[PDB]
Amino acid sequence: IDNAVLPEGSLVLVTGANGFVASHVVEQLLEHGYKVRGTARSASKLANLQKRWDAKYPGRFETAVVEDMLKQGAYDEVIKGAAGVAHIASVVSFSNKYDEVVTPAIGGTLNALRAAAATPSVKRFVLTSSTVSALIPKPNVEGIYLDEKSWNLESIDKAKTLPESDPQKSLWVYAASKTEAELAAWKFMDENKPHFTLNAVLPNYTIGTIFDPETQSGSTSGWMMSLFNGEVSPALALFPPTYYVSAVDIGLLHLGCLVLPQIERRRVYGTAGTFDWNTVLATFRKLYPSKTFPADFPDQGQDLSKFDTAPSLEILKSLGRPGWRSIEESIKDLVGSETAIQ
Template sequence: MSVVAKGSTVLVTGANGYIAGHVCDQLLQAGYKVRGTVRSHEKGKWMYELFDKKYGSGQFEAVEVPDMVADGAFDSAVKGVSGICHVASVLSFSNKADEVIPPVVKGTLSVLTSATKEAGIKSFVLTSSSTAALMPVPNKEIIVTKDSWNDESVKQAYESKDPDGFVVYGASKSEGERALWKAVKQTNPPFQVASVLPNLNIGEILRPGGAMSASTGSWVPKLFQGDKEPLYFPPQWYIDVQDTARLHVAALIDPSCNGERIFGFAKPYYWNEILEILRKNFPQKQFPGDINLDKDLSKAPNEDAEALLQKHFGKTWSGLEETVLRNLAQLV
């Protein structure tokens, strides 16, 4: 039994982003129509070209929402939709907390408020992040539960004189998701609500020519091109971006997801594994030598997410090698 009927329209915010584009793609593939919000029509042009070719014209439309924190920003966009995936966020990685955290919180509450004004909405999914629950600490075992929150990053973001931009981003995802659940508890909206917390997203890049600017999806392409910067990010768990999108679809349509935090953690990786995959598949290229052996030892409650993938898509997590190779498809 699906909460959102096939053929109905689902709103995806920030639709031209790396994850959101895949959420649109998986929804279309599953038989839904998609309305995506973009800051300008120009940003949505490539999506029409891609999705019209794959699914036929009229299945996808882009609408402008220039500023997600403006009062009533999504009131028009939600008209006539049956479900919402709120993926848009602030990805500036600024280290100024006041420039990142309040807009993420306000944007989330703005979409939720608009949703409550539209009687036909059956389901609401928030794209949160693993960083809402924890920050990766190499070689330290961290036990994550469904009640875990990244309080340390929130504290650092506001109290440190010069916080790291990644820490501020984590604080914004933590505060944004908490604001959602607080509002849901207070208002008891007439639709189901779930959140998806993916860890490091890598995999296929949908936007033509977008390999070097696809958020975390650009890390492996940069490494492939000789840029060592990604090696300075700590190892984490990875997830194929298509699996993240599939989890959004499952969270939207499956009644068992109401009120749930769904942890999109496939498996831990470390950079030497990715370097080994690159050397194996591209022996003609030179890659950096192995670096330190730091690993992510955290434990996450990912069983429900894996079960949802199996239930709705007949598969579990995509493997690291296939995900890395899909990530490089635009470059090879």
């Protein structure tokens, strides 16, 4: 990558590297000649992915264990030698209680940022936020344009007082946690003025290959894979139409945020195009004509929102892509195509 701010062969720390989106960030870093150190709560969580990257990119990926993401000093050992950091602000919804979900998301982000501020070698930091830090997808709402100034401020209070019976409450709690974490990151940058530059990537609904299905199935692509296999969730039919984005493209967006000189203090939207479950089902049926699939879902309406994707397309162009990968190609990355083996 010409004029890269992180030299070729530099080491990037990717937190939560076992996660589905994170594993695509790692893969695109490795694909472009960078070394990666990936953290997980236990070595077992990375063993399969470690096996894949040792085969695919020998000697370029290393597992690092961070048992407590919140503990002070948690990243102080693993960050040493890193020229960049990719922190994925993951949300653990083991509970309905706002404080149990939102606070660890902020706390993990601040901990990673503190570690970077104490490491002079770190030059770039990329935070994985979400489009929910701008808005919750709402079908058939006109006049929604999201840009780098759009913030989901409402989600913070809304997530606190929604009825438990509301089918969308978990989505709102996830939105509050992503919003609060991204806000905390930008506030950290302004208050502490650290030596590194921060960028945020805001993926929407990421569709792509699941490298290790046994552990990565609790992901956007994992849910789509369960649908492919004939599973239907009641929350599935109440999910709003939204934007998809290819998992490779999301990995590229993080790579550009880490290495490209023209990308500083940006919020980069991962929003390729709109979709609903019936477009997914139609693509399943074309890719596997012999397979039986669930029936079409009742109409969920249409997403009329639009996103300012100018820095995203700039990054994609700088990294050699004509534009967004198509949903049909993205879905094919996930489920493959029907083959008659002879």
